[PDB]
Structure formats: structure tokens, C-alpha cells
Scaffold this active site. Structure first.
Site, PDB file in Angstrom:
ATOM      1  N   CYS E  31       0.835  -1.193   0.000  1.00 23.10           N
ATOM      2  CA  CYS E  31       0.000   0.000   0.000  1.00 23.10           C
ATOM      3  C   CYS E  31       0.875   1.249   0.000  1.00 23.10           C
ATOM      4  CB  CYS E  31      -0.938  -0.003   1.210  1.00 23.10           C
ATOM      5  SG  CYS E  31      -2.299   1.176   1.135  1.00 23.10           S
ATOM      6  N   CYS E  34       0.223   3.595   2.863  1.00 27.28           N
ATOM      7  CA  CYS E  34       0.973   3.144   4.028  1.00 27.28           C
ATOM      8  C   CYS E  34       2.367   3.761   4.061  1.00 27.28           C
ATOM      9  CB  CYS E  34       1.054   1.618   4.050  1.00 27.28           C
ATOM     10  SG  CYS E  34      -0.465   0.813   4.601  1.00 27.28           S
TER      11      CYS E  34
END
Ligand SMILES: Nc1ncnc2c1ncn2[C@@H]1O[C@H](CSCC[C@H](N)C(=O)O)[C@@H](O)[C@H]1O
Lengths: 81, 283, 78, 386, 108, 55, 301
Positions: E31, E34
Site C-alpha cells: 500500500c 501506508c
């Protein structure tokens, strides 16, 4: 400004007198306010714009225009011949 | 960073829009290529909606004029060709004009298929003086400017309308160059004129998307002896003369012909084909 | 001057237009014709009919109509 | 006021206006050219494992649909704090109709209070939900539901009991007003265990949907199919892109379902109807960045393109050619959205620093004096004989 | 400095006692948000030199533990107050640093 | 904010002149019961020289 | 599988530094082939970048118009030979290489000590010949660039030598489809297929900026955050938010009036305040009752 110059001469019996009067008015402009002319404002262009404006026709002052698209200071437009 | 902006926009009427757009900073030569591609896309790759065919009901006797209508049939077709439409339709739909009687028939008097809209409802079509019902059956299509004429309906005596699918009336590009020494920079300006069925910003976006869609497919992937002559070779006279009749002079040309073509030429048999292979194998 | 001469040199006419003895698009306005020219629909010198909504101001030979098509309903085409 | 409803038809996107929130991500295969990847491996960034997110929130789909020239309205709740007002403003400047967005002064945006049980293992047991989970049945805007011709929602709205009830009420109201119901699964993270509980949760809304879009992984999960193919192998064998027969998707079908879209990213999109089925190949060799690796923008663009094409011609939902055109258009929209996101976010080098693709593909001068690429003083030269 | 701690280590830290706010980052390596949240939390940990603790738990390695914490997606942060009386804050999405500062200075 | 806050002559009268190079600047033709008259359509600001009104 | 396909119909390596390729693309709708051909030609001839030697440094040379004892070529010929070396690299920046050999012998392009990001296309390219065992150390400068340009070297960065395309009618005029052929000549630094793909990507990157958000659309990676910082700053020294940043969506309006304002391109509160009553009257479905109720609603704010 070419159209304005032609328009101003439609009311002049003699064009040489017109040129002399414009030069005298520009000289007065320069003598009264020396520092305002020579750069972006030219005295003869200011005289022409004022004479056009005196007829009631709106014009930018001394036909002074710049380029809004200049990419910051230092960049000079390169003309495409 | 490379950014774009609309620097001017106008709406003189409902069928005349203008816009001016900017794109900077660009490298040398990029602005011209972008402008050329964008102008081609704007002028021919954008889809427009137009009336392409008209059917006259109520038995007009197939004459140049209809009783009670001020305008002639050709005048009516010319008026219909000027109606500006927008839609998202896929395929071809039908529209209908059915006005009771006396008065002015405008674009507002057109019953439209679900997706079709009308840019200007004040566009004149025909003038009726006598109380006579006029029924016109319109065919509406959506095509690109660079497109063509589809399969013609020769039947039912329907008059075609030579529609020009140009939602973008005009387009121009210009380049401004700047520089201070070794580093240069140029600016792209794009002017778009549309007939109101699209804004110049919408036209710009559609042209960009059409160009990108035109250049996506190139990235698609898929699922997983000149100087050894016939005469120096000891050939039978029958085989030798046949080769000259077929204009073969060098062993390179002899090996250039498959066995299929060797048999085709006249007076050549299967035995000669086998004889040729043996001699070549021996040399 | 050459560009203007080529631009204003009109259609090929007569035997230079048709091989055989003959026993064209209609545009609402000039912008439509120019747009069709841009889309390669017509050539620079291909004939076309342009609807005129001004006064008669086309320089032409002072001649009577070639043919008048008079309809019994009253309309006639000159 | 049906005469004030213009064109294109309005689309209502029901859900949450999250900011860069990814439901889940599954291992995936994409069409790629591997000679180029081997040649360009020092300049083009690629993930070690290709994992693709199904998409994002409903606000993202509303924003993407507006960018395509469509008419989109977002129905949800945001708090009146700075984050909620910023999200509302961002939705407003993206031409998304926010008149159906309910502003709650008693709720906090994107924040929930959790009561952690510290006796046994750790559970959170949400007590006070966030702002975009507290939309009541009375706060549903019915004017936008009357105007809208298609209703869009996701499974993230079914995780909370009250929000699930609100979603059911909105779906039923939209169906009463003759709208087309678009169910975008986008299976959340906790629902990837216990397929049976996922079916129990989504069975009611599955039967009320006219168009359903699921990924290939989601279709396999709901059909009880184990992934038989290989992942992260440098080839494009057809076993990685298989068009399941309608008998495979037969158990999932119901009476009112019109179209089922099975997407494999922008590489391939499969459509299923009662009379027609087929697939359209695409392209997924788009610029990818560590900030954009989940490929959620591609899914949002695909869904937005599907919605746009289905709404502009709602009477061609059974036309095979129009379905092929719709799939191709959705592929193109996803590709464009992924390209734009890659350009916007940039590569890693509010504390957020990013470098451009130009800076990422810039190497060191290799002008280290100890390096073998510099004219050392004549004392140490190390000539090589010709 | 954000340290990667397993589920049992986080259990030990929670069931223990601490005098500083604890921020738990639920993330995955696939991600991008993230990574952006990692940069934000790195700046935040620079801001709070020793008065706070920021840890990261990988969701793919601790999927059962993440499901037990009602982690509905990524990026997800958990703000654990040192006082056992108060409740934890679960933030979903890529929130700005000012929100984290306000949470720590108001309800921690 | 903008949201919170003798008859004119026959237009053809000036139009027939205008199409034939008649120009009226800053004035409009108005007709009353007494007769036709010429009135300043705006504030004619005083300049250094005489201003052109009609041509 | 795809209705529109492309394929390389011929690939040919005339020499080590002259590759040829012909590609097909059919079926295309009428007019698409011309656009693709012209844009692809201009991208191939102007937008593809190459890697070249741009500066070489000598040590015992008065000027580039002099000779070296034992080297058959003068400095000018050595520089001309260096200008003809074809390199390949995917990265930018001014990398440097080294030529450091002892004669006698032939100095070919395989004698250049390249950084790991730069590769030699043709090892047999000639630089100079050493007749006797003399020392020769040359420091090189290498960068990747577009177009064309210690002694400077006039580097021509264009790796595509020539391009051509042709358009042919597909057949019966169902849609007057067309067939596009593209011919590419490269210098071996990249194959014609690589040139085609790079030209497509460069064209997409040139056309993609118009699909971004217009300049000055969001308040100034993540456009949301600066507006959040502005809101945080406004929270202190309470002065509320400007009308330009407040939209008519958050003003409680009847749906008909909302739609009428939206179709007239009215989006923010500043636009609503700067509007005039007469212009709103000029819009249909907007009566004087609507005007007075809208004024009352605005006064309530
Ligand atoms: N100052 C004045 N007061 C009253 N009548 C006047 C006037 N100046 C001019 N007139 C009238 O106007 C006429 C001049 S023609 C001026 C316009 C004329 N009133 C018209 O409507 O056509 C004269 O016959 C005179 O009777």
C-alpha cells in the site's frame, strides 16, 4: 495606434503642423516629468493617446503593454522571424 | 511543473463558444507537435450529433413545394441541416416533427430520442400559414468529423441531409518562446471555437482523451552462388533450354524457385525435377 | 500572387470536367464549406453551391438566365 | 420537477468520503511485456509481488465519474471539524454534488472510539462510530434519489449495523423510484475470512442489484474457487486470464440481475448477461509508483467508466456491442486515472517528500576519486594493455 | 523511529504499563498510502522525541490479529492512551499530522 | 453585493444612419410629446479639447 | 483476440548500428491513420532521447588542431571518432567514462570503461590507432538528452535515423477502414519496436497534462492537506471562511433552485453574491417568488 494616427490627421489641414505640434507637446511632457518617460512610457505615444482620449475614445495610456506570460524575471521572448 | 489553464472564454450566442488555453513550460519542439495533434483531434476525432436524413409524410406528392408551407422542401432540408444537437447515442435513433398547423416550426418542435438534446430551440425550420399538419421523420446519427457516409437507405423516398459533423468550428495553436542563455522555454496556446454543443474545455479534454486512446494500442501485449552458372553445370539439353525460356541463368535463381513453380513452366516433367536434385547433390 | 491565383482559379469546366457530354454539395454558409474542406470532404477547386443571404454582389457576365424552370404553382427557378 | 432534470442523468454514490483508504488487496496477474521489464528494470519501478486493490470509497468513484463529464452526487455524512470540512471542500471543487452530504456537529470525521478488552485477547468493539458511519434513515436525501437514475454503493457501508440499515433503506427507496442499482463489491479486509459470513452479510443487497462489479479474486472467493494459476512469473500465459463460463457464475445470478462485470484490473474485463458473455482485453503497463502500487485509481476509473456508459445509454444494457464498447471505455478510463495518479504523487525519495519520475531516473555522477571512472593522479594509473 | 512489532509483542506492551501515548500503525508492504503514513509518522516521531511511542504491525503477517482489532483497511492507526480508563482511537485513512497532534494533546 | 441591492427613439432611426457611417458617441435619441431630441446616454466627462458627439 | 491489432511485419539488422523494422496497425477508422502517422513521425524524429559522449579531456595537447607523436590520427580526428560512438542508457545525468590504455594497437569502443548504467552498442567502432607504446588517458563525459548540442563534442542525441508511414484502404466501404504501416530506422541504441513503444509513451505523456486539474483549482502530492492547514490557521484568530470557498451545496435551497443555479454555472457563495437579480430573472423556472425566497435564505446566513 496606426488607426489612431490616421484618425488624428483627418482633422488636420497640414500634416507637418500636426507633427510639429505633437513634438512640442511631447517636449513639454518630457520637460515637466522627465523620469516618467523613456522606458515603458514614451512621450510621443502618450501625446497620441491623450489626443485620442480627448475625443472621448478610450485608449491605454501611451499604448504601454507588456506580456502577462513571461515566465518570471530574466526570461526574454525570442522572436520567431 | 507542466500545467494548463484557460486564459479566455466567451459565449457570443448559444451556438458560438470561444475559449483560449495555455500549456507551459514546454521543451523545444514539443509545443508544435502537441498543437498539430490537438488540432487534428479537435477538427476530426470529436463526435458530433446531426440530422442525417428526413422523411416527409402526408403525401407531399414528391414535389418541390408543399401546399401551406412557406419554405420549399429543399429550404426545409437546408434549415434542418443547421440544427445543432448534442447526445451520447450509440447507433442511430429517430426523431419526429408533428406540428398541428399555422405558426412557426422551430427546433423546439422536435420530439427527440432519450439521449439527444437541442442547443438552440429558436432555430427556424418551416413556416405554416394554413391549418395543415406537417409530419417529418428525422434520422439522427453520431459520428466523427473524419468519418464518411454509411449505408444509404434507397427506399421509402427519404431525402438525405449532407451533415458535416464538426462540433468544433475552428481551432488554432501558437507558440511563444522565452530564454535567458542556455536554458529555453516555450508556451503553447490553443484556441477552440465550438457550436455550443460542447464547451472549449470539454473539447480540449475530449481531444486529449481521443489522442491517448489512439496511442494506447501500440502498448498492447497478447496472451501466450551468384557466379556458379547453369551452363557450367553438365545439364541435359532439354532441362537447360527450359530454364532459359523461363529466364533462369544462375544457380542462385534456380534455388530461389520452389519445386511447385519448376513444374509449372512448359515442357518440364517430374523426371527432370529428380534429375536436377541429383546433379546438385553431386556438386 | 501565385498563391492567390491558384486560390481564385475556379472549377475545371466543360470538356476538362467531364469525359462525356452531360446529356455538387449545398452548404448553408461559408463556414460549413471551409470546415468540409478542412475535413478533406471537398477539394480547393471542386464546385459547390453556397446559400447567399446578402444582396447580389457577385461579379459575373451580364447575361440572362440560361434556363428558367417555371412551376405551375408560381415558383420559378432562374 | 422532472422538467429540471438535465443530461447526463444524475448518479448517486452512497458511502463514505475516505481519503486514500484501501479496503483490501489480493495477489493478481497483469498483462505485461517482460523483455521491456528486463531492459527497463533500472528505470521503471515494479512491485516484487503484484497485489491489486479492488478500488476505493464511494467518494472516489463520485470524483472519478465527475472527471469523465458525468453528473455525480455523493450521499454520506461528514463531521464539521477541519478534516470533514476539507473533505467536503475537496468533493465540492471536483464538481461532485454535495447537497446530499449531511454535516454532523456531534461526530468526528474518520475517528472512532474503541473499547479494547484487556482481559483476554485484544478486541476493539467500536463504541462510538465515525462521522461517515452515522447516516440515519431520516438523513437520506430523497430529492437526489428521485433525480438520480442510477444508485451506487459498496460493501463498506454494510459493516456497521445502523449504516447497513440506512443502506438498505436507500437501496429500497431508489428501487421504488425506478433507478438502476449498481453494487460495487470491493470486499473489505475482515470479510476475506469465512466466506459464509460474507455471503450472509451481502445476500440481501446482492439480490437488489441490477449491475454488479467484482474482481476476478472476488468472483473466485464468492464461487468457492481456489486460485490454480501462478503469480509473479514472467510470462502472459492464458491460464492467468481465464474467461469463466456462465455456468461458473450461474450460482451467483438472480432474477433482477442484468449485467455482471468481472474485472482483472485494466488488463481484462469480463461481462455476463443472460444471453451474452465475453471479455475485452486492455493494458496495464502504466507507470507505477510506491505511492500508487495498490492500483485503486484503476478500479475507480473502471467503475466510473462503466457507470458513465451504462447511464448515457440505459436501453443498451443487453446489446453485446455496446457492452464491449463499455468495457473498452472503462479500461481506458482506468489506465488514464492510474497514469494521472502516478504523475501526481511521484516517487518517494505533513512530512511527505516526493521526487518526480525525472529525478527517480537520475543516476549518480560516478565521479568518486576512488572509482574506476576518473583520471587518477599519474602515481596510480593502472593502464590496460591493448 | 517506528519499530516493527509482532502481535505477541504488542500484547506484551499493551498488557504492560507505560507513561507515554502509544501509536500502533497497521500497514502492509503493498500500500502506497501506508508509505505516506510511514513518512508522516516518521516526522511525528521526530516531533515527539521520547514523550510518545510509535510502532508498526504488518497486517499480512498478523491478519488474524488485525481482524481482531476491527481493522477495516489501510492505512489504520490506533492511539492507545497510557491511562487504562480512557478508550483507544482508531483512525482510518491518511490523516494529517495536525489531527494526530490534536488527538495526543486532547484525548490521550 | 449586487444580489442584495421621454421615451427611447425607434432603433431603426439610428440604425439606418449607422449602416451608412453615421456615428453617435455618448448620446442617445429620445422622443417626447414636444418632439425628437438628443440626450447624453451617460456622463460626458470634460476633456482638454472638444469631444466628438456625432458624425 | 483484439479487434484492432498491431504487429511487426519485418525486422532487419543491416549492421551493428542500423536496425530496421516495419509495423502494421489495422483496422483503423478513416482519418485515424493520418493522425497516428503524423504524431508518431514527429515523436520518433523529435521526442526520443539518446546517450552520447559530449566532452573529452586530454592532457598533453596545445589545441584540438594538433598531432600526437606515435598516434596516426590528430586530435581532431580522435574527437570526430569519439562523436560517432553509439551508447545506450535509461538514466539521466552527466556520467563520466575513461579511456586509459597503452599502445601499440587499435583503440576500439570496447576500450571505454563505462559506468554500470551505460552500455556500448558497437564494440568495433574505431577511435584511434597507437603505433608505438605511448600512454593515452582520455576522460569522457556522457549524458542522456534530446536533440543535439576538456574539448566539447557536438553530440547528436537522436537515435532514430529515419521514419516513414503509409495508409491504405482496408477494403469495401463499410466504415472505410484503413491500414497503417510504420517504418523505423534506428542506430542500434534501441530497437525499432522499443522506439515505437517509447514514442507512444512520450506522446501519451505529452497529451496527459490536459487531463489534470486546471491550474489554480485547489488551494495552495496531496491537494487536501494545504486547505486543511488553511482551516487550522483560520481556527486561530477566528475570521471564518471566504465566500469563494463556500459552495451553494451547503446552503439549504429548494432542489429546483439548486438545479437552476447549477445549470447557470453558479457554484460558490461569492458567485451567488456577485450575481444580479435581473440575470437570475432571465433564467427560466426562476420567478420573483424564487428571488425573494432565495434572498430570505441568504439573509438567514
Ligand atoms: N428650445 C426649444 N424649445 C421648443 N422647441 C424647440 C426648441 N428648439 C427647437 N425647437 C423646435 O424643433 C424644431 C427643430 S427640428 C428639432 C427636432 C424636432 N423637435 C423634432 O422632433 O423633429 C423647430 O421647428 C422648433 O420649433
Amino acid at each position: 495606434m496606426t488607426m489612431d494616427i490616421e484618425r488624428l490627421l483627418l482633422s488636420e489641414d497640414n500634416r507637418f503642423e500636426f507633427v510639429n505640434s505633437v513634438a512640442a507637446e511631447a517636449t513639454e511632457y518630457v520637460e515637466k516629468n522627465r523620469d516618467e518617460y523613456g522606458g515603458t512610457k514614451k512621450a510621443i505615444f502618450h501625446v497620441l493617446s491623450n489626443r485620442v482620449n480627448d475625443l472621448g475614445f478610450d485608449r491605454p495610456e501611451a499604448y504601454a503593454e507588456s506580456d502577462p506570460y513571461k515566465p518570471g524575471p530574466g526570461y526574454l521572448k525570442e522572436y520567431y522571424t | 511543473t507542466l500545467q494548463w489553464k484557460c486564459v479566455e472564454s466567451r459565449r457570443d450566442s448559444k451556438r458560438l463558444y470561444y475559449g483560449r488555453f495555455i500549456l507551459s513550460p514546454l521543451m523545444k519542439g514539443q509545443a508544435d507537435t502537441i498543437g498539430i495533434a490537438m488540432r487534428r483531434a479537435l477538427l476530426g476525432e470529436i463526435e458530433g450529433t446531426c440530422i442525417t436524413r428526413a422523411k416527409f409524410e402526408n403525401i407531399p406528392h414528391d414535389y418541390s413545394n408543399i401546399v401551406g408551407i412557406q419554405e420549399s422542401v429543399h429550404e426545409i432540408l437546408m434549415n434542418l441541416n443547421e440544427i445543432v444537437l448534442k447526445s451520447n447515442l450509440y447507433g442511430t435513433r429517430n426523431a419526429l416533427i408533428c406540428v398541428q398547423g399555422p405558426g412557426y416550426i422551430t427546433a423546439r418542435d422536435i420530439i427527440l430520442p432519450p439521449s439527444v438534446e437541442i442547443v438552440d430551440n429558436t432555430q427556424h425550420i418551416a413556416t405554416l400559414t394554413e391549418p395543415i399538419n406537417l409530419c417529418i421523420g428525422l434520422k439522427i446519427e453520431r459520428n466523427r468529423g473524419y468519418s464518411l457516409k454509411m449505408s444509404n437507405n434507397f427506399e421509402d423516398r427519404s431525402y438525405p441531409i449532407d451533415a458535416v459533423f464538426m462540433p468544433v468550428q475552428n481551432a488554432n495553436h501558437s507558440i511563444h518562446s522565452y530564454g535567458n542563455g542556455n536554458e529555453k522555454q516555450e508556451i503553447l496556446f490553443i484556441e477552440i471555437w465550438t457550436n455550443g454543443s460542447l464547451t472549449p474545455k470539454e473539447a480540449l479534454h475530449e481531444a486529449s482523451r481521443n489522442l491517448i486512446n489512439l496511442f494506447i494500442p501500440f502498448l498492447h501485449v497478447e496472451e501466450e552462388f551468384q557466379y556458379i552458372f547453369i551452363d557450367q553445370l553438365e545439364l541435359p539439353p532439354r532441362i537447360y533450354n527450359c530454364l532459359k525460356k523461363s529466364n533462369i541463368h544462375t544457380l542462385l535463381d534456380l534455388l530461389n524457385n520452389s519445386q511447385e513453380d519448376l513444374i509449372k513452366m512448359e515442357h518440364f516433367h517430374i523426371e527432370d525435377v529428380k534429375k536436377l536434385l541429383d546433379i546438385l547433390e553431386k556438386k | 500572387l501565385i498563391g492567390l491565383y491558384v486560390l481564385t482559379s475556379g472549377t475545371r469546366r466543360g470538356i476538362c470536367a467531364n469525359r462525356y457530354n452531360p446529356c455538387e454539395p449545398f452548404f448553408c454558409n461559408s463556414y460549413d464549406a471551409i470546415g468540409a474542406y478542412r475535413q478533406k470532404r471537398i477539394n480547393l477547386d471542386s464546385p459547390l453551391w453556397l446559400r447567399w443571404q446578402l444582396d447580389q454582389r457577385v461579379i459575373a457576365s451580364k447575361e440572362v438566365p440560361i434556363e428558367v424552370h417555371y412551376e405551375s404553382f408560381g415558383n420559378y427557378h432562374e | 420537477i422532472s422538467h429540471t432534470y438535465g443530461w447526463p442523468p444524475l448518479v448517486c454514490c452512497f458511502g463514505s468520503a475516505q481519503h486514500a483508504f484501501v479496503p483490501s488487496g489480493r495477489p493478481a496477474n497483469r498483462l505485461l511485456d517482460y523483455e521491456r521489464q528486463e531492459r527497463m528494470k533500472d528505470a521503471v519501478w515494479a512491485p516484487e509481488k503484484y497485489i491489486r486493490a479492488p478500488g476505493g470509497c464511494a467518494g472516489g468513484v463520485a470524483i472519478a465519474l465527475a472527471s469523465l463529464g458525468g453528473k455525480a452526487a455523493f450521499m454520506g455524512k461528514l463531521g464539521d471539524d477541519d478534516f470533514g470540512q476539507a473533505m467536503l471542500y475537496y468533493l465540492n471543487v471536483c464538481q461532485v454534488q454535495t447537497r446530499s452530504v449531511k454535516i454532523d456537529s456531534k461526530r468526528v470525521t474518520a475517528c472512532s472510539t474503541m473499547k479494547i478488552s484487556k482481559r483476554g485477547r485484544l478486541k476493539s468493539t467500536c463504541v462510538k462510530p465515525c462521522a461517515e458511519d452515522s447516516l440515519s434513515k431520516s438523513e437520506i436525501n430523497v430529492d437526489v434519489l428521485k433525480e438520480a437514475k442510477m444508485f451506487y454503493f459498496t460493501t463498506h457501508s454494510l459493516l456497521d449495523k445502523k449504516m447497513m440499515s440506512t443502506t438498505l433503506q436507500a437501496i429500497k427507496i431508489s428501487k421504488q423510484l425506478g433507478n438502476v442499482i449498481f453494487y460495487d463489491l470491493n470486499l473489505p479486509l475482515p470479510l476475506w475470512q469465512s466466506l459464509e459470513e460474507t455471503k450472509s452479510l451481502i445476500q440481501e443487497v446482492w439480490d437488489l442489484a441490477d449491475v454488479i462489479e467484482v474482481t476476478k479474486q472476488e468472483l473466485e472467493f464468492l464461487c468457492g474457487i481456489e486460485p490454480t494459476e501462478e503469480f509473479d512469473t514472467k510470462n502472459n500465459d492464458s491460464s492467468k486470464f481465464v474467461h469463466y463460463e456462465p455456468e461458473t457464475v450461474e450460482p451467483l445470478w438472480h432474477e433482477n440481475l442484468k449485467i455482471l462485470f468481472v474485472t482483472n484490473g485494466t488488463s481484462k474485463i469480463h461481462y455476463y448477461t443472460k444471453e451474452h458473455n465475453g471479455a475485452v482485453l486492455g493494458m496495464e503497463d502504466v507507470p507505477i509508483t510506491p505511492f500508487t502500487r495498490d492500483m485503486s485509481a484503476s478500479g475507480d476509473g473502471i467503475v466510473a467508466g462503466l457507470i458513465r456508459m451504462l447511464t448515457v445509454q440505459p436501453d443498451l444494457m443487453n446489446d453485446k456491442g455496446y457492452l464491449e464498447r463499455t468495457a473498452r471505455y472503462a479500461i481506458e478510463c482506468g489506465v488514464v486515472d492510474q497514469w494521472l495518479l502516478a504523475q501526481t504523487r511521484g516517487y518517494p525519495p505533513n512530512g511527505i517528500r516526493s521526487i518526480t519520475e525525472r529525478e527517480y531516473r537520475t543516476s549518480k555522477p560516478y565521479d568518486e576519486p576512488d572509482g574506476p571512472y576518473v583520471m587518477k593522479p599519474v602515481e596510480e594509473r593502472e593502464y590496460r594493455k591493448l | 523511529l517506528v519499530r516493527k512489532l509482532s502481535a505477541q509483542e504488542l500484547q506484551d506492551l499493551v498488557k504492560g504499563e507505560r507513561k507515554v501515548p502509544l501509536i500502533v500503525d497497521f500497514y502492509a508492504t503493498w500500500c502506497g498510502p501506508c508509505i505516506l503514513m510511514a513518512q508522516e509518522l516518521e516526522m511525528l516521531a521526530v516531533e515527539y522525541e521520547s514523550n510518545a511511542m510509535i510502532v508498526k504491525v504488518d497486517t499480512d503477517d498478523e491478519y488474524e490479529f488485525a481482524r481482531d482489532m476491527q481493522v477495516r483497511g489501510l492505512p489504520t492507526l490506533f492511539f492507545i492512551s497510557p491511562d487504562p480508563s480512557k478508550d483507544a482511537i482508531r483512525t482510518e485513512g491518511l490523516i494529517p499530522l495536525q489531527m494526530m497532534r490534536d488527538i495526543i494533546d486532547n484525548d490521550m | 453585493f449586487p444580489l442584495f441591492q421621454l421615451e427611447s427613439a425607434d432603433p431603426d432611426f439610428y440604425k439606418i444612419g449607422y449602416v451608412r457611417r453615421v456615428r453617435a458617441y455618448g448620446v442617445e435619441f429620445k422622443e417626447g410629446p414636444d418632439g425628437f431630441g438628443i440626450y447624453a446616454s451617460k456622463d460626458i466627462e470634460p476633456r482638454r479639447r472638444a469631444r466628438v458627439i456625432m458624425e
